[PDB]
Design a binder for these strands. Structure first.
Length: 155
RNA sequence: UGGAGGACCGAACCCACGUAUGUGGCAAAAUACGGGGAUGACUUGUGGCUAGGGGUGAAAGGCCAACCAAGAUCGGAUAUA
RNA sequence: GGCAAAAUGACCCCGUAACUUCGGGAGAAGGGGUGCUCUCCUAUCUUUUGAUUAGGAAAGCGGCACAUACCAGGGGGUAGCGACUGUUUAUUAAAAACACAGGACUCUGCUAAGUGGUAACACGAUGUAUAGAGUCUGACACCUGCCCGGUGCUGGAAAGUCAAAAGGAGAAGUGUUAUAAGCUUUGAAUGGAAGCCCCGGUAAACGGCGGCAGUAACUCUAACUGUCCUAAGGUAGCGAAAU
């Protein structure tokens, strides 16, 4: 009897199930997967406090057994599918119009300038860069690779 | 039967497209006649916030007290030339 | 440069094309009618008494003229750019500029990434990958070729190469002594993470995408091949174009 909407610690949870609304620290409060209809999935139960979970990001983590979850995927699966159809919809949600790089005068974004469209060089030009010299394509992480690799190689 | 629309025509309203006027003018940016949208990414009143290598920008090097590729005013300072 | 000026305009009726995303084009275009008088019937109307006001029949009646003044769309055919409504250089540029929903890539497992500050801390967000940030393009349809050699971004192997801290052992100054003790100066074999070096990965990352020389019963050109070079040698498509 694993029934939908119910919660419990993972210690009373069986392998292969589907879950959402996990909490990272023991009882802190559900901060893991929460969005409209997105489902994690457990992978095993070694009785060492930890439980290996596969998250929607594809990657996986270990959560203490005394932590909790909610059976079944979150509600409302379509929201990730509904395509808006004008500008007013964004505006209502809260957005404002976002301006690109190659538009701004060079004084304002590293991609500026040009007499007509252009951004960077054929030798010099580094890549496409954020407003603060940080590059955004290629797999860039900016020395948070330290944190990533530490928490990974804890496996 | 219903009454949706970043729907339509058109005053309030805002905005500022063309011509002519004016060019110590009525006015240090207006007027006449025509123009565009006109339930929406709307217009507005009130009061609060962001302050100069900074703000803010549906991005023009635009705007920040009538003159911004770095405000105003004091001071270094009778700067230098 | 038909700029301006002119003209069309209203209501009712007739009828209305290409095209298509089948919602629209569309007030498409193109026409007619519009006054008042009495009568008839119709409705309607309690504002009581039966008539009055409007509509639509049908007969007059006058004017050149009957939305008579004021008010009030010029329309059609076809390219380019942009999908459009929007926004912008207050106070010479409102556009093809910007945005825009739509698309892809990259980053983030939550003390989330990213941002402001020194720093607490705040935003992110009383949000949790169908989420948030950045980047390029810009509805829709058809589609999106080749190159990772360069710049960047990135994974990774042991090798050497390592800066500093760790520092052998020499040498040297001075000390009876002519050079032991001792202090001191310099040293200086090993030490050394990243990175450098190397091998990879990336083009909806920044970027680049060629020459020659012969060759057919008309020349031509070359379907054919020989060729030099690259990392790769411009595919679909388009084309004296905003080029």
């Amino acid at each position: 009897n694993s029934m939908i909407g119910s919660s419990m610690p993972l210690g009373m949870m069986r392998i292969g199930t589907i879950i959402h609304n996990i909490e990272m620290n023991p009882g802190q409060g559900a901060k893991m997967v929460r969005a409209a209809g997105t489902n994690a999935k457990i992978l095993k139960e070694p009785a060492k406090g930890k439980c290996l979970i596969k998250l929607p990001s594809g990657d996986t983590k270990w959560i203490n057994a005394k932590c909790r979850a909610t059976i079944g995927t979150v509600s409302n699966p379509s929201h990730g599918t509904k395509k808006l159809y004008k500008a007013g919809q964004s505006r209502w949600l809260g957005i404002r119009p976002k301006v690109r790089g190659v538009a701004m005068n060079p004084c304002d974004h590293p991609h500026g300038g040009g007499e007509g469209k252009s951004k960077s060089s054929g030798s010099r030009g580094r890549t496409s860069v954020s407003p603060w010299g940080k590059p955004c394509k290629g797999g860039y992480k900016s020395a948070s690779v330290k944190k990533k690799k530490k928490r990974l190689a804890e496996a």
